[PDB]
Symmetry: C2
Subunit: 163 residues, 2 copies
């Protein structure tokens, strides 16, 4: 049984764990520096201030996933465009948590004057691309070797969903 709800500062340690795991063992985050609670508290506050959602998926009283969206491009002209992110705990995959989280964001976006959702996915992450496509996202394009991690060049596949 999984329940999604708005996150609170109390959920930050569980969100941090998921975040730091992606930083170390995935290409979902293009950064190699783990953050501390204070860093996630600032991140959480920044989202709250802008009215951006932060949703957690609760499994066994623990945070098994989280999702949020925010600026895609920092310009007033993009007011109606937001870039979303969805993360599922390494030990909670295969339960459909990912799709429920993304759907939760789509629903919030649609009611938050959001016209377009943008996804920045590591090009080789087939699971993520298929998840987005299953939700109506369309492939915009693939940027070649724009990122680097694990000592290798990474491509960025962007997708869009008009609301």
């Amino acid at each position: 049984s999984v329940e999604l709800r708005d996150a609170t500062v109390d959920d930050l340690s569980g969100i941090m764990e998921i975040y730091n795991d992606a930083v170390v063992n995935t290409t979902a985050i293009w950064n190699e520096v783990v953050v501390d609670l204070e860093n996630r508290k600032d991140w959480f506050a920044a989202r709250t201030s802008r009215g951006f959602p932060v949703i957690v998926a609760i499994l066994d009283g623990k945070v098994a996933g989280y999702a949020s969206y925010g600026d895609w491009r920092a310009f007033d002209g993009y007011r109606h465009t937001r870039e979303h992110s969805v993360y599922v705990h390494k030990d909670a995959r295969g339960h459909g948590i990912g799709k429920r989280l993304m759907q939760a964001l789509i629903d919030h976006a649609g009611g938050n004057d959001v016209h377009v959702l943008i996804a920045a996915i590591e090009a080789e992450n087939t699971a993520s691309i298929r998840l987005h496509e299953s939700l109506g996202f369309r492939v915009v394009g693939r940027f070649s070797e724009v990122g680097t991690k694990f000592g290798r060049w990474l491509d960025l596949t962007c997708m869009e969903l008009k609301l």
Copy 2:
């Protein structure tokens, strides 16, 4: 004749004028925020610190255009990817200033450990698209209605140049 060189604080008011003009009558900048001298000063100080170039084209003793690049995506993993912008003064068009400014940016980037240059062009700006193509940029994709200005939705065509 036109000549290109590094911008100094003394070129900031001229740069400001070109920037503000773009904000007022074009889709080159997605917002309606007119900037003052202090803004350009901070902007100029931040780029100088990051080692990002600020090149101006001088014609008839005045700034006939300027160019620069900075972060594309504010993340450590994108350290070798930069987004550039080139602006030609409205009264100095048709002098090949645009191409020369972009070439200068490409040259600087090639010696600044930049692997990819990214162009974010308003979709209908065919002239800009062609200018980038003449310099080797290739289309990645086009985002639909991700921006708004002048009361209408704008599309964003992104292009890339691998160095």
